[PDB]
Ligand binder design. Sequence first.
Ligand SMILES: Oc1cc(-c2ncc3c(N4C[C@H]5CC[C@@H](C4)N5)nc(OC[C@@]45CCCN4C[C@H](F)C5)nc3c2F)c2ccccc2c1
Ligand SMILES: Nc1nc2c(ncn2[C@@H]2O[C@H](COP(=O)(O)OP(=O)(O)O)[C@@H](O)[C@H]2O)c(=O)[nH]1
Ligand SMILES: [Mg+2]
Length: 169
Amino acid sequence: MTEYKLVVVGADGVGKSALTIQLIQNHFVDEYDPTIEDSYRKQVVIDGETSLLDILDTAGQEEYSAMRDQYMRTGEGFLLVFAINNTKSFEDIHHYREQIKRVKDSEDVPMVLVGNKSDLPSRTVDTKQAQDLARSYGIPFIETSAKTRQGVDDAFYTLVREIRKHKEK
Ligand SMILES: Oc1cc(-c2ncc3c(N4C[C@H]5CC[C@@H](C4)N5)nc(OC[C@@]45CCCN4C[C@H](F)C5)nc3c2F)c2ccccc2c1
Ligand SMILES: Nc1nc2c(ncn2[C@@H]2O[C@H](COP(=O)(O)OP(=O)(O)O)[C@@H](O)[C@H]2O)c(=O)[nH]1
Ligand SMILES: [Mg+2]
């Protein structure tokens, strides 16, 4: 069966775990241990294709080791998640994108930019600013809310579609 290895990256607190648990369990977690990195599998049908999504929800200390490089390199596509009420998390997107390119040793890595927490009124990152960033990277931008589930399926399925495009090259 077709399988996709998806990796969810971004600053602490942006909603990586809540996005992952919504996709996998269809519920919103108000609290999920910030330090816990884990992986989950889900069988999905996307554009008629049955596949298994293996999703790594990243966490942990900031450390750079050969072992970490090697397991991040196994990801086939990456969600670059920031929160729309946290400018620093948007500023950190560049860093996560450069580290992914470093370990994949490629400029052409499937990615999707994800602006999460779209339900909150306190926005500090304008939608146009994030659309411009995604355009400069050549990747899709999706606004999500793990809380209301807006955009959650779209973010992950869009990443699968980006992987397919890559595999056709
Ligand atoms: O070997 C690696 C290690 C990594 C990696 N692991 C972990 C990282 C990390 N953690 C700390 C917090 C945030 C998420 C998790 C893991 N909890 N924090 C940052 O940066 C945080 C910032 C804020 C404070 C200063 N720093 C520099 C920049 F200002 C942003 N970067 C990381 C990184 F790059 C890889 C990441 C993606 C792809 C391949 C990778 C290979
Ligand atoms: N209002 C709202 N809160 C969210 C959303 N996503 C996550 N959160 C909350 O933001 C906090 C951090 O989420 P978490 O998934 O732990 O972030 P992570 O550190 O990136 O794994 C938790 O209290 C979540 O309940 C969202 O879309 N909207
Ligand atoms: Mg988490």
